[PDB]
Design a protein around this nucleic acid. Sequence first.
RNA 1: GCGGGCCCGGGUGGAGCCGCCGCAGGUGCAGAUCUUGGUGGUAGUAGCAAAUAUUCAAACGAGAACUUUGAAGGCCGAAGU
Length: 128
Amino acid sequence: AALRPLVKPKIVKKRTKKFIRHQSDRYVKIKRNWRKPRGIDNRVRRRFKGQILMPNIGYGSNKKTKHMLPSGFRKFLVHNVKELEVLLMCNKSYCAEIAHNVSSKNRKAIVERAAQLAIRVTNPNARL
RNA sequence: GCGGGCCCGGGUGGAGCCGCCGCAGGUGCAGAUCUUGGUGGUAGUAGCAAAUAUUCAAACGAGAACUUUGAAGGCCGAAGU
Ligand SMILES: [Mg+2]
Ligand SMILES: [Mg+2]
Ligand SMILES: [Mg+2]
Ligand SMILES: [Mg+2]
C-alpha cells in the first residue's frame, strides 16, 4: 500500500540491453564502457551486418516517461531533512533518495519525516 | 540515461569527503618492436652425457649412494690429478 503516483503510464523503451564496447569481450583491458570506433577498417564503425550496434539519437526514450522509475516516480537525492522538506509539493511525482553517506542515526529521522509528509523513499529500510 | 557515466542495497575498510555557482590545468589510452613492475601457456618440458669406476662393513646421526673409518678394485703414472 505505497503512495501511488499521479500518473502511471506504460513505459516503453526502444532498447534495454547495454551498449558494449567493440572487442570488450576479447580483452580484459577493454572495458564495457562505450567508445566510438574510429578505425579505417572497422566492421562496427561502418555498420556491417550482424555486428555490435552503435548508440544513436534514435534510441532516445519518450520525454513523457524519461527518467521515470518503474513505480512511476523520479529519483531525488536527499542528504538531510531540510532537503527532504523541499519535495513537499512534488510528492505525487517525485520520490526522495537517501544518500549512501548518511548515517543510520539520521536516516530514521529522514524516513519518519518523509512518512509524515507523505513522500516515498526508495530505500526506507536500508541500513537500520 | 541513446551515450559519455551516474544514484541506491550488501560486504571489507578505518578518517576524511562531496554537490552547486565561477576560476585554473602536468585533466580521460588499446596499440607507439612505448617505460616500469608483476603474472601465464610453453612446462614438470629442453636439460643436469668432454677427460675408464666403483663395491662391501661399521660409526656419528631423526634422516646416508655422496660424511668419516677399515677392506677391495681403479686412475693421475715424476713435462702428474
Ligand atoms: Mg595498458
Ligand atoms: Mg577503407
Ligand atoms: Mg625429461
Ligand atoms: Mg691414460
